[PDB]
């Protein structure tokens, strides 16, 4: 307390902070959809030269 001793009513002998106890999606795995892997690299290798 560098500059906080000169004041008359600064309370001490008490803790500053009063805390409490510090204590501590499924549709992708369904059965009616044949889920496909995207794999963009394979699709790019597929559509590599199919011009338009």
């Amino acid at each position: 307390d560098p500059k906080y001793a000169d004041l008359p009513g600064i309370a001490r002998n008490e803790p500053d902070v009063y805390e409490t106890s510090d204590l501590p999606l499924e549709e992708l795995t369904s059965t009616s959809v044949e889920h496909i892997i995207v794999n963009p690299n394979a699709a790019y290798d597929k559509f590599k030269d199919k011009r338009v």
């Binding site: 549709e27 959809v33 889920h35």
Partner: protein
């Protein structure tokens, strides 16, 4: 000038951006412009006073929320300009909006004024050298590597279905109804108000969206569960509170299959798919029923594909092979396919250059968009 093009994937609820070539859209954020409600006092607080992005998600309660794109139609162009600037900002891409061609995305059957004004923005404010607006079905097909298959997607605002047979889009076989995830969230808010848990603030609506995205399932038997008793599973709010949802957790996503609940004569998603298939020829319905690629955000409910197969089998003719495939990252299908398409060599001819826009204008966009 033809650098790595920018694949901007719009969405009425969750925007998706990122450069072409990335296997995952590295920069995704919700599509809402948040601005503070309360009066600022302390000097040195948050600045800008228009929050877009993760800052709008971290300080949800502090700000108001208003969406600029409803049912795939842009309602506020100023907010979308700010959102696109945020896409090019220092927090998402850190690049200039003139050194890259832009690949935008739109839902089909949208009004022509959206396409017009959107390209006006990307060619007047942002001085993009080349823009190419395109659908979403084609992009999900480029992502899955296929060339056929009916693409059905239930995004946040548009639930459409566009069938494609070996790279031949059938424009008149497109069904689009504006009954989507945002409306399911709204119907859920209505049932919660009928429960007691009355969420009404704009920034509080996101909590309803989280509840929908988390504690909601679609029962296979519609009336059997729709008329019986529930179990009232509890849910924890961000307050630290507890909410007993109950019967609304299953009646809220039923809206997607029967829009009579909201009081609107339309069709369910299954009728959208069935009618989109039946509107085509007679020598394609077998290949279309055997190839259904789901996508879109709202096609993630627990017990969704089950009810789709049940409804489709009730509607499709007997002994017809019905298959429903879907990608793994269902939320980033269209963007991945956009990255694939924009990373090709035909994309040099697919776009619309700036000089083309200076010569013709809106007409060139309407011509080269199809």
């Amino acid at each position: 000038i033809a650098n790595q093009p920018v694949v901007i994937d719009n969405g009425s609820g969750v925007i998706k951006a990122g450069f072409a070539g990335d296997q995952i859209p590295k920069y995704c954020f919700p599509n809402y412009v948040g601005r503070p409600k309360h009066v600022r006092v302390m000097a040195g607080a948050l600045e800008g006073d228009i929050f877009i992005g993760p800052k709008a998600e971290e300080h949800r309660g502090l700000l108001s929320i208003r969406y600029p794109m409803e049912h795939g139609i842009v309602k506020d162009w100023n907010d979308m300009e700010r959102i696109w600037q945020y896409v090019y900002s220092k927090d998402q891409l850190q690049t200039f909006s003139e050194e890259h061609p832009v690949l935008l995305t739109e839902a089909p059957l949208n009004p022509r004024k959206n396409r017009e004004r959107a390209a006006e923005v990307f060619f007047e404010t942002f001085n993009v050298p080349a823009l190419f607006i395109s659908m979403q079905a084609v992009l999900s097909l480029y992502a899955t590597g296929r060339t056929t298959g009916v693409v059905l997607d239930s995004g946040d605002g548009v639930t459409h279905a566009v069938p494609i047979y070996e790279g031949f889009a059938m424009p008149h076989s497109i069904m689009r109804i504006d009954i989507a995830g945002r409306d399911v969230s709204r119907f859920l808010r209505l049932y919660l108000r009928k429960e007691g848990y009355d969420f009404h603030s704009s920034s509080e609506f996101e909590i309803v969206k989280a509840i929908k995205e988390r504690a909601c399932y679609l029962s296979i038997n519609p009336q059997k569960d729709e008329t019986l008793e529930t179990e009232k599973a509890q849910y924890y709010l961000p307050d630290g509170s507890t909410i007993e949802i109950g019967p609304s957790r299953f009646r809220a996503p039923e809206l997607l299959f029967r829009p009579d609940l909201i009081g609107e004569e339309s069709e369910g998603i299954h009728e959208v798919l069935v009618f989109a298939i039946q509107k085509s020829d007679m020598d394609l319905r077998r290949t279309l029923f055997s190839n259904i690629v789901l996508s879109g955000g709202s096609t993630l409910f627990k017990g969704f594909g089950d009810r789709l197969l049940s409804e489709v089998k009730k509607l499709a003719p007997k002994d017809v092979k019905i298959r429903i495939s879907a990608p793994q990252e269902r939320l980033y299908s269209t963007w991945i396919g956009g990255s694939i398409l924009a990373s090709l060599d035909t994309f040099k001819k697919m776009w619309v250059s700036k000089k083309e826009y200076e010569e013709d204008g809106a007409r060139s966009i309407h011509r080269k968009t199809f």
